[PDB]
Amino acid sequence: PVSEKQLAEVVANTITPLMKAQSVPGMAVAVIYQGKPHYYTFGKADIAANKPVTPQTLFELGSISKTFTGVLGGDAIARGEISLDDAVTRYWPQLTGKQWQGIRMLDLATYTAGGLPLQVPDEVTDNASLLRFYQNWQPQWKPGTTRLYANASIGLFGALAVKPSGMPYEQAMTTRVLKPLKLDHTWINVPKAEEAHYAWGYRDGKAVRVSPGMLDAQAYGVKTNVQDMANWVMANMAPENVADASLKQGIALAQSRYWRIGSMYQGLGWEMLNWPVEANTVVEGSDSKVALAPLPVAEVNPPAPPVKASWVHKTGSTGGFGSYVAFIPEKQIGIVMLANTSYPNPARVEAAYHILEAL
């Protein structure tokens, strides 16, 4: 049974050399081992103000925000409010272009609509321009044939998934997901009273924070601390412990397997590989060259329910932040790495695999 002081040793020996090689200002780390969350903090949250990183320090999750979007969407399906096979036009009737015919909610959620772009153009600033962007979009591929990771895709999924609730995205997310799991320090909009905890991200010696953007909340705008994130991983790793029924099923639906892309499977927000897996496979798959590339998919119909023998993970970044989350349900172990500088994905995955290897 790994000793507590042995776990502390492993973490330090992997993280300190990482921060020195990658010039990382600060980092909060959480390792889940045998039903227990272990926190480790390093460096500075604010270089100028010389504020240290603490368990209450808030970091920008960037794309890991998509795991929340997927679970919220999952909860909505579990309630009967939406169906994955539903047409997108059912929820947004103004989307009249013929190219939208045949596109389902599943496609928006899993990046298989046919080439929706990585980013929403900054030229888009309101409902009118947002509608125009989608009406004029010309697909490169037919639906359900190619996966192309994109904010413009799952971003719209989240915006539409909450319409039946009648609540605004931020409210739906707080009342159906955050409050039930007691994630009291997870925000889309950081309150005045909590700003003292919001770290600064760094890029090229400059201090930056994420900028407002269309569909930002649904695709990359969540901020949180290592504690709420640790409890987020535990809720997803062991969903039987979740009290609310729709939420519990929502989490199962987000970890289901809808498509196979080589050795990886696409869930709602979450990405999975079968466990056991070699390090090289997870690491090279995380490189922008593969991760952002368009690749062919194989449909998993019926969708396969959650497989415990899986490596479930998600990378996430913003201009000045770099984060990573990974867990293996069968072994009940997980890891959270939040940093205030965006360093290469491969280096993040390698560090996490090494640490989980010692458990």
Side-chain angles (χ1 to χ4, degrees):
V2 167
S3 173
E4 193 93 286
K5 235 58 183 281
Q6 261 174 301
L7 188 80
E9 180 165 43
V10 181
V11 175
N13 293 336
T14 295
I15 296 300
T16 75
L18 188 269
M19 288 173 83
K20 186 170 300 295
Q22 299 291 163
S23 301
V24 178
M27 187 174 314
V29 176
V31 176
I32 287 94
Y33 180 68
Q34 287 190 175
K36 218 276 181 172
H38 296 68
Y39 306 106
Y40 306 112
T41 57
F42 312 80
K44 310 295 182 186
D46 185 334
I47 300 174
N50 200 218
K51 313 245 295 166
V53 171
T54 72
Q56 304 88 70
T57 294
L58 298 172
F59 292 78
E60 302 180 343
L61 294 181
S63 291
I64 297 177
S65 289
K66 293 179 177 76
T67 65
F68 283 94
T69 308
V71 171
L72 186 55
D75 176 84
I77 294 169
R79 289 167 186 263
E81 292 170 352
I82 69 159
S83 169
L84 259 6
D85 50 272
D86 278 350
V88 178
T89 55
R90 175 157 195 273
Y91 304 100
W92 206 15
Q94 304 104 300
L95 218 53
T96 62
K98 307 187 200 314
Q99 74 273 47
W100 282 93
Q101 280 171 42
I103 294 181
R104 309 161 293 184
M105 282 294 273
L106 171 61
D107 298 306
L108 286 189
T110 55
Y111 321 122
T112 58
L116 278 180
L118 179 59
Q119 291 301 336
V120 174
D122 26 63
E123 195 187 12
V124 166
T125 66
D126 62 24
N127 184 72
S129 58
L130 182 65
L131 177 59
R132 207 205 321 306
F133 166 61
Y134 288 117
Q135 282 282 67
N136 288 159
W137 168 69
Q138 259 262 289
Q140 307 169 57
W141 307 284
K142 287 146 183 57
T145 66
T146 309
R147 173 186 184 281
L148 182 62
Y149 182 91
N151 293 328
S153 188
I154 193 167
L156 186 55
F157 170 69
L160 298 185
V162 302
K163 293 184 81 168
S165 83
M167 301 175 276
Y169 193 82
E170 170 169 34
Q171 191 185 327
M173 182 66 76
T174 297
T175 56
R176 320 240 277 211
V177 178
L178 299 185
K179 287 194 280 174
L181 294 179
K182 286 72 192 73
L183 305 183
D184 299 333
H185 293 283
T186 295
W187 318 93
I188 284 193
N189 282 130
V190 188
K192 250 294 165 175
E194 280 269 284
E195 251 189 77
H197 297 291
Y198 197 174
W200 278 94
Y202 295 97
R203 185 185 58 205
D204 294 355
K206 152 173 47 55
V208 300
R209 273 173 184 161
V210 77
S211 293
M214 281 268 80
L215 304 186
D216 59 1
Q218 299 87 338
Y220 57 83
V222 177
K223 295 94 184 177
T224 195
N225 65 45
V226 86
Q227 289 181 288
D228 276 10
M229 196 81 303
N231 284 293
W232 176 235
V233 166
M234 286 182 279
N236 280 269
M237 174 166 62
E240 52 268 35
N241 294 171
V242 174
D244 267 350
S246 65
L247 187 53
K248 178 199 305 290
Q249 174 59 194
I251 289 170
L253 288 168
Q255 274 181 66
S256 292
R257 302 174 170 202
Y258 302 92
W259 309 94
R260 173 167 56 73
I261 304 82
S263 52
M264 79 130 88
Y265 298 78
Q266 187 64 58
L268 303 183
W270 290 113
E271 292 171 21
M272 299 80 57
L273 293 106
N274 285 154
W275 173 268
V277 275
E278 247 87 301
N280 166 59
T281 301
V282 190
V283 174
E284 68 179 49
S286 76
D287 179 343
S288 313
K289 274 203 165 190
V290 172
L292 299 186
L295 293 175
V297 303
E299 190 181 7
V300 177
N301 194 332
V307 180
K308 277 60 197 179
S310 297
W311 166 283
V312 196
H313 74 164
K314 189 75 188 73
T315 52
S317 306
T318 56
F321 289 77
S323 304
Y324 184 62
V325 175
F327 61 91
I328 305 166
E330 168 166 279
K331 291 188 175 291
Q332 288 172 56
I333 57 181
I335 188 165
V336 171
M337 291 165 61
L338 304 180
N340 64 338
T341 193
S342 185
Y343 59 109
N345 282 334
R348 309 184 200 174
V349 176
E350 172 158 346
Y353 189 96
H354 289 169
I355 291 178
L356 295 183
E357 187 155 64
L359 311 182

